[PDB]
DNA sequence: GCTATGAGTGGCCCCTGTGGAGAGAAGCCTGTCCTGGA
DNA sequence: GGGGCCACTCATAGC
RNA sequence: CAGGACAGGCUUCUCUCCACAGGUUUUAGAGCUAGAAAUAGCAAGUUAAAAUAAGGCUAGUCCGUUAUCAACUUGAAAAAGUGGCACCGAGUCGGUGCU
């Protein structure tokens, strides 16, 4: 028999509940065949469970990293351009200078030339470091002096300016003096480069203050001198300079010291101003306009161009390189092979900063940038939507609000529809002359004045007309020619002008396109038009409203709004009327596009990708549940911190509804109407919560993971209750211990390792940053991420004698080696010293792979060297009820009688606490093996045994954190903190039972490792 | 008897900050309304 | 919040 | 009754592109004096280069952390196919009968 069965669902952010029940609230149980090589051939399981998986991630970080990579690449390209310009003369002075610049990061053993980067000899380097202690001194020297300097110093200064050219927030060239004063604290020192003067002044103040502080400290507190000037570990000056301490840390540490001594008034004031001992490369410099650097560059080039012809002949190139920037409406410069590129090319030469404007069509680039993201019209998927400020759109809005305005005058039996002449007269008299029009204004100015209807009753509008001809008023203010605005032949020209003013944002390109239409207006109008900008887009297309014409009458939807006779069909009525070809045109335009895959259709929805993942997982769960029951289709499907999580929980319902309804019923009747064999019911959680609260089925999110399954089961029960012993059946179902809980196996992806680059050490677990940079000499990354684990059976030459030893262990692959591993596993396994590879025994072990051990103890393979708790705790319902009522003993919100009775029930069964502790201890002994922590918990229990009941319950709820699924977590019990017990040994599972589970946990194949790899 | 290697227990660490431009989606209220059920 | 790493201590095989 | 559409305000979030300021790492910036060395005293400390996921071929001023992923058979892959039912009981499921 096709037993009537229903599928209930509870959809969360990371969990998917599923349940199958009969017509009488019972969950059938089946005997399932079990594959593998073990003895257990058949296992009986209930048709109830739940699924858990990791939260989905937004694509923000990948985009950020991509933008950063592009920043780095473009900066290096600019440096390469500068070296390309300079290299010709460099060979005549010192040909190996650029080699030394590139090869500085290596040790002296790996340097191909002398170790000194700048001059190549120690005397000149010392002289340079003495004469110019900081680069700002060299910059000021080149700006102010008239001396012929060595080209190397010029290159150094120019490269330093180019690599750190500063921001672009300010437009044009350079109350403003106050902004400069905030940027530039220099007062009167007469030079063209104030920034260098400010930095030098800060350096001098730092030097003098350091000398004074050394003097005073050595005078009065000799003992603290060592801490301040030698100890790198503390937040003192040594830490501020040679350590990692920040400025605020240094000020906070130095504040009490200066308070203890005299003569520190000015130093304390400077500390209050954050001006004491301040570096040159700080987080303050973000506010520097790039025009200062441009001016310094220009001054240096102007002063030095009289000695070096190539500097003079290439000054424009250098200024461009400093000032060149790719417009934000162009995008990446790729030849089609990049999925983010939309640039259109005039030719195929290499793009350089000196010829960018000739190769890339900026206008077409902006058009493609704007168009590729705009919505398409739903009714006509082949057309773009008009701008919201378009004239036809405003006319459509005004008339559509006016279309259903019904007017009643004295002597008229029924409300009448406005005539096209009336519509046009009203619009011309009020809307084209007033920005906002109310009902009283209409009554006074059209009915009373024009048609002499002194009293009129107007229905359909209460207060006013929200539509407005704002664009009309703006164009009348600019053009000041009503005849030009009212011309029908200029409607195309006006629409083109509006579209041009809406698409682009640059003044130059807007002028460029509108230059073809300057023949109609003066220069003042063109400039006034130039400054006008509009944003936003509509929801309808031009072709729908005024482009497609009814072949019988030739009218458009615009004409139907203006003049259709007594019918006065509005926008909703015009599309649904069968007398017009427009609805036939709509159905024809419903392109039978290639059926989006369920993945694609889910990916096409609105929300974070995590909710889409949840949708796909729920659909696959439903599909497998249907497959299990003999492919007989079901009757009914009943479906249901940080804010976005619950937002997505409420957002799931509708989409799950239409996707399930679409896939389920695919058969149409003889009239092409869909025969709906499946009923989709959406219910909000409040009804289920009320059902829970009325019948004492409390929900505790801290005990275990059966709450999802119970929520789904109650969802199905309550949903089927309205469309169609019972409480006894529910109570029997809820206390069932065997529930299918499944953890989804995953292959980890992401960054190769952590980002903190650590100093050099003598260890084998450091990762090089390049191909030829041994970490023992240069340090590197740490903590690589495990991709997945493979079981290997082979022989290893061990010991100093290199003796072959047959082995069986786990070797986890890092994400950096996944491609290398799957390219040729034999070569990779030979690389790590394993020989006589047993290819047939390679087993894929992703994260959360499950192993079964004796006494039912289970472990999930968290990584190549760590395990997680896999066994689940099952508690009787009475203990759950007692614990919940105890935890909210004083938080009960209800009638006094029931609250007092529940509190009395809590009072009576205090002996439950010992039973709860004993059962927790037994479960921990049997599956957790946490003897020391268990003893600590037991000792703490007896210690606080006189505490009030509610506090006892609150502390007990914390205990289940030790027994929950996943990685062990620390928890607090009264005043005691319990450390986390971590399993760092994976050897015990090499001879255990390996289990593969279906996505619902019913189909499974068991593999025993004790037989694999045997001699 | 000496040294080296695994094996358990406790402890410390994990890149940050902003500007400019656009497009879209969702939810909450008022007006105007439709499509299905019943 | 959760997995890699290190310092210290300690049992044991090789020798 | 549920869902849906167009306008007028309120809020929150998502997707794409263009820039800037840091931080980290190694090296360079002759430490001295006394002492055989361990070590003790003195002195100085603000800056610079390179890299910032290993790299790849389609060689671009491009791409590299989004999503998808139980097992077996066909398939390069996408993709497709592959596993009995009923009845009684319940500590991670057990028992009874049929096929």
Curated annotation (Swiss-Prot):
Changing residue 165 to A: Moderately decreased DNA cleavage. Residues 596-640 are annotated as: RuvC-II. GO terms for biological process: defense response to virus; maintenance of CRISPR repeat elements. The keyword RNA-binding applies. It holds the Pfam family HNH_4. It comes from the Bacteria. Only has nuclease activity when bound to both gRNAs (crRNA plus tracrRNA), which results in conformational changes in the protein and formation of a central channel which binds target DNA. Also requires interaction with PAM to trigger catalytic activity. Nuclease activity is inhibited by EDTA. Residues 1-62 are annotated as: RuvC-I. Changing residue 66 to A: Significantly decreased DNA cleavage. A motif (PAM substrate-binding) lies at residues 980-982. Endonuclease activity on target dsDNA requires Mg(2+). The RuvC-like nuclease domain should have 2 divalent cations, while the HNH domain should have 1. Crystals are often soaked in MgCl(2) or MnCl(2+). Mn(2+) 1 binds at residues 10, 640. Keywords: Antiviral defense, DNA-binding, Endonuclease, Exonuclease, Hydrolase, Magnesium, Manganese, Metal-binding, Nuclease, RNA-binding. Mn(2+) 3 binds at residues 944, 975. InterPro entries: Cas9 (IPR028629), Cas9-BH (IPR032239), Cas9_PI (IPR032237), Cas9_REC (IPR032240), Cas9_RuvC (IPR055228), HNH_CAS9 (IPR033114), HNH_nuc (IPR003615), RNaseH_sf (IPR036397). Residues 746-1015 are annotated as: PAM-interacting domain (PI). The active site is at 10 (for ruvc-like nuclease domain). Residues 56-596 are annotated as: Recognition lobe. Its EC number is 3.1.-.-. Has 2 endonuclease domains. The discontinuous RuvC-like domain (approximately residues 1-62, 718-765 and 925-1102) recognizes and cleaves the target DNA noncomplementary to crRNA while the HNH nuclease domain (residues 810-872) cleaves the target DNA complementary to crRNA. CRISPR (clustered regularly interspaced short palindromic repeat) is an adaptive immune system that provides protection against mobile genetic elements (viruses, transposable elements and conjugative plasmids). CRISPR clusters contain spacers, sequences complementary to antecedent mobile elements, and target invading nucleic acids. CRISPR clusters are transcribed and processed into CRISPR RNA (crRNA). In type II CRISPR systems correct processing of pre-crRNA requires a trans-encoded small RNA (tracrRNA), endogenous ribonuclease 3 (rnc) and this protein. Belongs to the CRISPR-associated protein Cas9 family. Subtype II-A subfamily. Monomer. Binds crRNA and tracrRNA. HAMAP family: Cas9. This is CRISPR-associated endonuclease Cas9/Csn1. It comes from Streptococcus pyogenes serotype M1. The lineage of its organism: Bacteria, Bacillati, Bacillota, Bacilli, Lactobacillales. The gene is cas9.
């Amino acid at each position: 028999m096709d037993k009537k069965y229903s599928i209930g669902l509870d959809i969360g952010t990371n969990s998917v509940g599923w349940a199958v029940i009969t017509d009488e609230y019972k969950v059938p149980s089946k005997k399932f065949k079990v594959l593998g090589n073990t003895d257990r051939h058949s296992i009986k399981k209930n048709l109830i469970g739940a699924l858990l998986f990791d939260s989905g991630e937004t694509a923000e970080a990948t985009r950020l990293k991509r933008t950063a990579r592009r920043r780095y690449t473009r900066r290096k390209n600019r440096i390469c351009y500068l070296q390309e310009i300079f290299s010709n003369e460099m060979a005549k002075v010192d040909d190996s200078f650029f080699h030394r610049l590139e090869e500085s990061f290596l040790v002296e053993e790996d340097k191909k030339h002398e170790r000194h980067p700048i001059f190549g000899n120690i005397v000149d380097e010392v002289a340079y470091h003495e004469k110019y202690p900081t680069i700002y001194h060299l910059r000021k020297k080149l700006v102010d002096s008239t001396d012929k300097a060595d080209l190397r110093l010029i290159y150094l200064a120019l490269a330093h300016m180019i690599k750190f050219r500063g921001h672009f927030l300010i437009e044009g060239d350079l109350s403003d003096a106050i902004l400069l004063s905030d940027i530039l604290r220099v007062n009167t020192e007469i030079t063209k480069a104030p920034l260098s003067a400010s930095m030098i002044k800060r350096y001098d103040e730092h030097h003098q203050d350091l000398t004074l502080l050394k003097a005073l400290v050595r005078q009065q507190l000799p003992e603290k001198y060592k801490e301040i000037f030698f100890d790198q570990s503390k937040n003192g000056y040594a830490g501020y300079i040679d350590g990692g301490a920040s400025q605020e840390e240094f000020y906070k540490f130095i504040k009490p010291i200066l308070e203890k001594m005299d003569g520190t008034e000015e130093l304390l004031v400077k500390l209050n101003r954050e001006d004491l001992l301040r570096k040159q490369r700080t987080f303050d410099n973000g506010s520097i306009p790039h025009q200062i650097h441009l001016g310094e560059l220009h001054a240096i080039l102007r002063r030095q161009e009289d000695f070096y012809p190539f500097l003079k002949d290439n000054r424009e190139k250098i200024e461009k390189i400093l000032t060149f920037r790719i417009p934000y409406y162009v995008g990446p410069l790729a030849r089609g092979n990049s999925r983010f590129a939309w640039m259109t090319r005039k030719s195929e030469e290499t793009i350089t900063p000196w010829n960018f404007e000739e190769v890339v069509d900026k206008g077409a680039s902006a058009q493609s940038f704007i168009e590729r993201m705009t919505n398409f019209d739903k009714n006509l998927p082949n057309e773009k939507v008009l701008p919201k400020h378009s004239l036809l759109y405003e006319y459509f809005t005004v008339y559509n609000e006016l279309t259903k305005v019904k007017y009643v005058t004295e002597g008229m039996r029924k409300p009448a529809f406005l005539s096209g002449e009336q519509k046009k007269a009203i619009v011309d008299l009020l809307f084209k002359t007033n920005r906002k029009v109310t009902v009283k204004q209409l009554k006074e100015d059209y009915f009373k004045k024009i048609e002499c209807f002194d009293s009129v009753e107007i229905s359909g509008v209460e207060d006013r007309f929200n539509a407005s001809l704002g664009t009309y008023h703006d164009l009348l203010k600019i053009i000041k020619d009503k005849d030009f605005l009212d011309n029908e032949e200029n409607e195309d020209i006006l629409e083109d002008i509006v579209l041009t003013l809406t698409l682009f944002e640059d003044r130059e390109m807007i002028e460029e396109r509108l230059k073809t239409y300057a023949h109609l207006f003066d220069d003042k109008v063109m400039k006034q038009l130039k400054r006008r900008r509009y944003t936003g887009w509509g929801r309808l297309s031009r072709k729908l409203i005024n482009g497609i014409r009814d072949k019988q009458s030739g009218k458009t939807i615009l004409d139907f709004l203006k003049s259709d006779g007594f019918a006065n069909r509005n926008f909703m009525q015009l599309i649904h009327d069968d007398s017009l070809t427009f609805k036939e045109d709509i159905q024809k335009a419903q392109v039978s596009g290639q059926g989006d895959s369920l993945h694609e259709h889910i990916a096409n929805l609105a929300g974070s990708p995590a909710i889409k993942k949840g949708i796909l997982q729920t659909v696959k769960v439903v599909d497998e549940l249907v497959k299990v029951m003999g492919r007989h289709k079901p009757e009914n499907i009943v479906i249901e911190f940080i804010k976005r999580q619950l937002v997505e929980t409420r957002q799931i319902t509708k989409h799950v509804a239409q996707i399930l309804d679409s896939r389920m019923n695919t058969k149409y009747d003889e009239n092409d109407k869909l025969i709906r064999e499946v009923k989709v019911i959406t219910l909000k959680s409040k009804l289920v919560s009320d059902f829970r609260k009325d019948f004492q089925f409390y929900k505790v999110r801290e005990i275990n993971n059966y709450h999802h399954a119970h929520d789904a089961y109650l969802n199905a029960v309550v949903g089927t209750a309205l469309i169609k012993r019972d409480f006894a059946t529910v109570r029997k179902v809820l206390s069932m211990p065997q529930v299918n809980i499944v953890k989804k196996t995953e292959v980890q992806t992401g960054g190769f390792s952590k980002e903190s680059i650590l100093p050099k050490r003598n260890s084998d677990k450091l990762i090089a940053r390049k191909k030829d940079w041994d970490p023992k000499k240069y340090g590197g990354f740490d903590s690589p991420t495990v991709a997945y684990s493979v079981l290997v059976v082979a022989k290893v030459e061990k010991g100093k004698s290199k003796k072959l030893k047959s082995v069986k262990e786990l070797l986890g692959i890092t994400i950096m080696e996944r491609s290398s591993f799957e390219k040729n596993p034999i070569d990779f396994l030979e690389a790590k010293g394993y020989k006589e590879v047993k290819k047939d025994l390679i087993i894929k072990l992703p994260k959360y792979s499950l192993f079964e051990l004796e006494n039912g103890r289970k472990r999930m393979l968290a990584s190549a060297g760590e395990l997680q708790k896999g066994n689940e705790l099952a508690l009787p319902s009475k203990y759950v009820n007692f614990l919940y009522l105890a935890s909210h003993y004083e938080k009960l919100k209800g009638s006094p009688e029931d609250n007092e009775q529940k509190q009395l029930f809590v009072e009576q069964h205090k002996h439950y606490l010992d039973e709860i502790i004993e059962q927790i201890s037994e479960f921990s002994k049997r599956v957790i093996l946490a003897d020391a922590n268990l003893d600590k918990v037991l000792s703490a229990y007896n210690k606080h045994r006189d505490k009030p009941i509610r506090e006892q319950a609150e502390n007990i709820i914390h205990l289940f954190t030790l027994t929950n699924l996943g990685a062990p977590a620390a928890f607090k019990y009264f005043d005691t903190t319990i450390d986390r017990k971590r399993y760092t040994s994976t050897k015990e599972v090499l001879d255990a039972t390996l289990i593969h589970q279906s996505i619902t946990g019913l189909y499974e194949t068991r593999i025993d490792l004790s037989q694999l790899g045997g001699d």
